[PDB]
């Protein structure tokens, strides 16, 4: 499974960790040169463990669902924390079993719930490697309100960067200074599903999207994506959510 140490980390090692993370996900085929994630997987094989070390060397192990890259829960010393949702509960049966105590967070793992519990929308939460180091720190010692904020940072600096090279770049720019995410970043995060389905719906349709995907851009200008010729498809998105899961 994969590892990343914030100590002595620079834009380069981060890039390498994200690359390892992408390669750690199984896929059988590619769609328009892109890894298509598996429809489903059975058993403990459905989960990837990320070992993260903050600057001082403390660690938390995070469980990721390899069919969609969703964070399911994590382990901190001897306590495991899982999201309050069906998938996370199913996941609790194959990972962190040697945990002495298991705690269910008072919310499911989607941005919407996480922003409510955290009291802030993610447009106002600064991300970057320094923020990741603090997120790790905040998760070592339970606090549901603080954990909500920490998880919004953790998802973005890992799962979202895995899915979009642009977001990986946004985090490399933020390796020594945190900064709230750009509008592009957030609409990208929100479109992973839509884009994933459309790219797949295009392979029997000459690469033309059945229905266009609207995104906010680098500057803040609304922009339509209608075919697989766009940058987003040619050199941004890196993983595709199988339509089976949409
Ligand atoms: C596919 O989508 C692209 C946009 O990514 C369309 O691009 C046309 O040409 C340039 C970009 O190459 C844009 O300035 C235009 O707005 C688009 N042309 C017009 C006249 O609107 C491209 O036409 C689309 N269609 C196909 C079959 O690729
Ligand atoms: C990014 N994202 C959106 N919904 C999500 N739900 C869970 N459980 N984990 C995630 O990382 C996630």
CATH label of the domain that carries residue 202: 4.10.470.10
- Helix ranges, the chain (H): 11-23, 86-91, 111-118, 129-140, 144-155, 161-163, 165-173, 183-201, 231-235
| Ligand 1 centre distance from Cα of residue 24 (Å) | 35
| Ligand 1 centre distance from Cα of residue 167 (Å) | 25
| Ligand 1 centre distance from Cα of residue 236 (Å) | 18
| Residue located nearest, by CA, to atom 7 of ligand 2 | 109
CB distance 230 to ligand 1 below 6 Å: yes
CA distance 181 to 167: 9
Q: Are residues 141 and 189 in the same domain?
A: no
32: left (phi over 0), alpha (psi -120 to 50) or beta: left
Q: Are residues 121 and 39 in the same domain?
A: yes
Out of 138, 162, 186, a domain closes at 162
Triad 43, 241, 28: Cα angle to 5°: 65
Determine which one of 29, 85, 123, 160 is catalytic.
Answer: 160
Contact call for residues 13 and 53 (beta carbons, < 8 A): no
Q: Are residues 153 and 180 in the same domain?
A: no
Contact call for residues 190 and 160 (beta carbons, < 8 A): no
Q: Are residues 18 and 104 in the same domain?
A: yes
Q: Which residue has the tokens 């010692």?
A: 141
Strands 2-5 and 47-53, bridge-based pairing: parallel
Strand partners, 64: 48, 71
Q: Are residues 4 and 96 in the same domain?
A: yes
Q: Are residues 143 and 225 in the same domain?
A: no
Q: Are residues 11 and 92 in the same domain?
A: yes
Q: Is 160 a catalytic residue?
A: yes
Q: Are residues 35 and 122 in the same domain?
A: yes
Q: Are residues 76 and 96 in the same domain?
A: yes
The number of domains in the chain is 2
Q: Which residues line ligand 2 (CB under 6 A)?
A: 70-71, 83, 109-111, 155, 159
Out of 93, 127, 162, a domain closes at 162
CA distance 187 to 183: 6
Q: Are residues 82 and 158 in the same domain?
A: yes
Atom of ligand 2 nearest to the CA of 160: 1
| Ligand 2 centre distance from Cα of residue 230 (Å) | 26
| Residue located nearest, by CA, to atom 8 of ligand 2 | 109
Q: Are residues 84 and 140 in the same domain?
A: yes
CA distance 14 to 33: 24
Atom of ligand 2 nearest to the CA of 88: 8
| Ligand 2 centre distance from Cα of residue 206 (Å) | 32
- Tell me the residue range of the domain where 185 lies: 163-246
Residue of 71, 153, 167 to mutate, ligand 2, most atoms within 8 A of C-beta = 71
User: Which ligand minimizes its atom distance to the CA of 233?
Assistant: 1
User: Which ligand minimizes its atom distance to the CA of 186?
Assistant: 2
Which CATH number characterizes residue 59's domain?
A: 3.40.420.10
User: Which ligand minimizes its atom distance to the CA of 162?
Assistant: 2
CA distance 52 to 159: 13
Q: What is the resolution of this structure in A?
A: 2.7
Contact call for residues 183 and 220 (beta carbons, < 8 A): yes
Q: Are residues 65 and 186 in the same domain?
A: no
Out of 143, 162, 181, a domain closes at 162
Q: Which two tokens stand for residue 225?
A: 């994506």
């Amino acid at each position: 499974d994969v590892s990343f140490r914030l100590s002595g980390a620079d834009p380069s090692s981060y890039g390498m960790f994200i690359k390892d993370l992408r390669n750690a996900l199984p896929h059988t085929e590619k769609v328009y040169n892109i890894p298509l994630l598996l429809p489903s997987v059975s058993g403990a094989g459905r989960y990837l463990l990320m070992h993260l070390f903050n600057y001082d060397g403390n660690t938390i192990t995070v469980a990721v669902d390899v069919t969609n890259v969703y964070i399911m829960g994590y382990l901190a010393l001897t306590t495991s924390y899982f999201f309050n949702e069906p998938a996370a509960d199913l996941a609790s049966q194959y990972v962190f079993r040697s945990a002495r105590r298991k705690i269910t967070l008072p919310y499911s793992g989607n941005y919407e719930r996480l922003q409510i519990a955290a009291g802030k929308p993610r447009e106002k939460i600064p991300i970057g490697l320094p923020a990741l180091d603090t997120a790790i720190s905040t998760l070592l010692h339970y606090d549901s309100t603080a954990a909500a904020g920490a998880l919004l940072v953790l998802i973005q600096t890992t799962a979202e960067a895995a899915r979009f090279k642009y977001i990986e770049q946004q985090i490399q720019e933020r390796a020594y200074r945190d900064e709230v995410p750009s509008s592009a970043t957030i609409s990208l995060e929100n479109s992973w599903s839509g884009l994933s389905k459309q790219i797949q719906l295009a392979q029997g349709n000459n690469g033309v999207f059945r229905t266009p995907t609207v995104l906010v851009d680098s500057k803040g200008n609304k922009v339509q994506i209608t075919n697989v010729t766009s940058n987003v498809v040619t050199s941004n998105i890196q993983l595709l959510l199988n339509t089976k899961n949409i």
